Amino acid sequence: SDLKDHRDKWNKYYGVSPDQLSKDLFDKVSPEQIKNSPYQSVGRLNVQGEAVATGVFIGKNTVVTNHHIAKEAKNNPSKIIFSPGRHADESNTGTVLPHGTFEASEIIDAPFGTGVDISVIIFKPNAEGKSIGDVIKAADLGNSNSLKKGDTANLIGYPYDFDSKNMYRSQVEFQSTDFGLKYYGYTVPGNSGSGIFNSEGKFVGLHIGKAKHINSQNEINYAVSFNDFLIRDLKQLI
């Protein structure tokens, strides 16, 4: 039965304490990997007082997150701080911001309707007058149309609720791909704004959260799916 199959698959990820999940389903990104793509584009989005989430940096002082995060700023952008590459130090007592942080200049709250849970934030430069583009490389957008059921990918972001310090790689398995993206995978609420990266390094989607599946008693993860229409429409800001 479809329900049992779902329950069973979902328990691969939620049946055990997250710390007992295998590294290949859920693992801390290491400081070496964070120097690289796809990892370096990803970063912790903070909204002072309100929320902690993820964002992917897409170029030229500009970062995408969920609309459900950004809105919380209430068109007051200096509540929003981005921190790319952020990770615990070796002991795991402290924190490293390898390229510091940024404060928001202004919010483009849900540019493609409240239909799509996405927002674009533009940050100012840092205290040195550097801009995110200077210090890290932009994530590389691509269509999701090539993904399909049973395929796997990498969700990458900051699972705050599990671990406030590090970026994690969550391996995900697609259940369907035509209208949005829906997948098995360990995520927590901080993963709002995590990035779906395919076997070629391409930013093809943006994790939103969880949604009812089969019935009200079950759920699955879903993301904004990326098509050429939105790729173009996004690249009109950067």
Domain ranges in the chain are: 2-31+140-229, 40-135
Return the CATH superfamily for domain 2-31+140-229. Answer: Trypsin-like serine proteases (2.40.10.10)
CB 63 within 8 A of CB 120: yes
Q: 139 with 38: CB under 8 angstroms?
A: yes
Please tell me whether residue 159 adopts helix, strand or coil conformation: coil
The answer for residues whose C-beta is within 8 angstroms of residue 87's C-beta and 6 or more apart is 29, 31, 34, 95, 96, 98, 165, 166, 167
Active-site choice (83, 87, 99, 117): 117
Three-state secondary structure string covering 62-119: EEEECHHHHHHHCCCHHHEEEEECCEECCCCCCEECCCCCEEEEEEECCECECCCCCE
Q: How many other CB atoms sit within 10 Å of the CB of residue 34?
A: 21
The rounded radius of gyration (Å) of the Cα atoms in the chain is 17
Contact 54, 44 (CB under 8 A): yes
Enter the CATH code of domain 40-135: 2.40.10.10
Verify whether residue 192 is a known catalytic residue.
yes
| DSSP letter for each residue of 161-205 | TT-SS--EEEEEEEEE-SSSEEEE----GGGTT-EEE-TTSEEEE
**What six digits make up the tokens of 49?**
């007082």
- Residues 108-121: b if buried by 16+ CB within 10 A, e if exposed: bebbbeeebbbbbb
Annotated catalytic residue 146:
no
Q: How long is the chain?
A: 238
Task: Tell me the C-alpha distance between 15 and 9, whole Å.
Answer: 9
| Catalytic residue (choose from 6, 41, 67, 68) | 68
Residue in 41, 144, 170, 192 annotated catalytic: 192
Is 134 noted as a catalytic residue in this protein?
A: no
Distance, in Å, from the CA atom of 206 to the CA atom of 14, rounded to the nearest integer, reads: 21
Model resolution, angstroms: 2.7
The answer to whether 155 and 185 are in contact (CB under 8 A) is yes
